[PDB]
Amino acid sequence: PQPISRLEQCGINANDVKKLEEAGYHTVEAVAYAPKKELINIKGISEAKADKILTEAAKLVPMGFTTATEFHQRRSEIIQITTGSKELDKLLQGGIETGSITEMFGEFRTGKTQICHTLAVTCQLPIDRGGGEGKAMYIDTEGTFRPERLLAVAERYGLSGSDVLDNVAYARGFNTDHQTQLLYQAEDMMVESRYALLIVDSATALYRTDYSGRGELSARQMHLARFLRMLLRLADEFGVAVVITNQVVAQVDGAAMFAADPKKPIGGNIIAHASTTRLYLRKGRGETRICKIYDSPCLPEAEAMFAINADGVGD
């Protein structure tokens, strides 16, 4: 929310800052906690100019250091965007913490791309439905983008079909490095239009298909982190959910029941703690979908069943 428009004073030359901001650093906040090396990584950036920013942005930093009392203020404004139905919001303190990247984990049939569809409708509306009064960023690295589902959940919600369709900006991602730069492109529009979702689907999948072999798997984590830490940066720039969805490893050397690791974290590296919530979306009986949060800072763990009704999540 703080572009170069705020940081362009007291001798901040204009020529260097457009180039500095062009590489996804459009928000000056990124420059505020930017590595000194990164501050100079972009070509055309003057070194003396980078040293000047080292103090200008630093004094611009809104929260260089704070106490734990203001953490209550930083948490009370979270609207807890409602997951949906009844129990899916009843057991947990609140649907989705604004800024909580979270994580999805299920096999097929579960509907990882349907809870994300009902959440998409539950952002464009006011606090009357616990929405975020903003649009969505549909980062579907799959081909399962079904805004027909978004209109179907828009029918039972009873708002509209025009803006509920228009607002979500789909991010068709074929590459890993083109999804990372697309989300930089989104980082170059969240300044003007207020967002709260960044609904991400199977982000890890492209990394798995591309970064394949044995050693290249460390590069898979390296680039999974280049994406992930930037997701943390943005999701702290506003109160943006940035919900994530992951696939199944299915440990093979694992067996012995409750110890066979049926759904092994496809992202057990860096995301092991980065992912705020770890709902275990699992097919049950008929249309029930039980889930348990392995990691969820302000919750030990629970069990949560939700059905994929004709119009999205429903209990």
The answer to whether 109 is a known ligand-binding residue is yes
Q: Which residues in the 100-129 window bind Mg ion by CB under 5 A?
A: 110-117
Share of the chain residues as helix, strand and coil, in percent rounded to the nearest 5:
40, 10, 50
Cβ proximity to its own copies: between 107 and 155 the closer is: 107
Cβ proximity to its own copies: between 158 and 213 the closer is: 213
Question: Considering CB distances under 5 to 8 angstroms, the limit depending on partner class, which of ligand ANP, Mg ion, its own copies, none binds residue 249?
Answer: its own copies
Rounded Cα gap, residues 245 and 263, in angstroms: 13
Q: Are 109 and 283 within 8 A, CB to CB? A: yes
How many other C-beta atoms can be found within 10 angstroms of the C-beta atom of residue 236? 14
The answer to whether 143 is a known ligand-binding residue is no
The sheet that has 200-201: what strands, in order across it?
169-170, 137-140, 200-201
Cβ proximity to ligand ANP: between 25 and 306 the closer is: 306
The answer to whether 43 is a known ligand-binding residue is no
Cβ proximity to its own copies: between 11 and 35 the closer is: 35
Cβ proximity to its own copies: between 14 and 146 the closer is: 146
Cβ proximity to ligand ANP: between 56 and 295 the closer is: 295
Q: Which residues in the 155-214 window bind Mg ion by CB under 5 A?
A: none
Site pattern 160..199 for its own copies (x: CB under 8 A): --x-xxxxxxxxx-xxxxx---x--xx--x----------
57 φ/ψ angles, rounded to the nearest 5 degrees: -65, -40
282: which strand partners? 290
Q: How far is the CB of 125 from its own copies (least distance, A)?
A: 16
Q: Which residues in the 129-148 window bind its own copies by CB under 8 A?
A: 137-138, 142-148
Question: Considering CB distances under 5 to 8 angstroms, the limit depending on partner class, which of its own copies, ligand ANP, Mg ion, none binds residue 132?
Answer: none
Among 9, 48, 72, 258, binds its own copies (CB under 8 A): 72
The answer to whether 110 is a known ligand-binding residue is yes
Q: 141 CB contacts (<8 Å, ≥6 apart)? A: 173, 179, 200, 201, 202, 203, 205, 206
Q: In sequence order, what E strands does 233-283 have? A: 282-283
**Is residue 295 at the binding interface for ligand ANP, with CB under 6 A as the rule?**
yes
Q: 68-77 contacts: CB < 8 A, separation 24 or more?
A: 77/239
The answer to whether 113 is a known ligand-binding residue is yes
Cα distance from N-terminal residue to C-terminal residue, the chain: 37
Three-state DSSP at 169 gives strand
Which residue ranges make up the site for ligand ANP (CB under 6 A)? 106-114, 142, 144, 149, 152, 202, 273, 295-301, 308-310
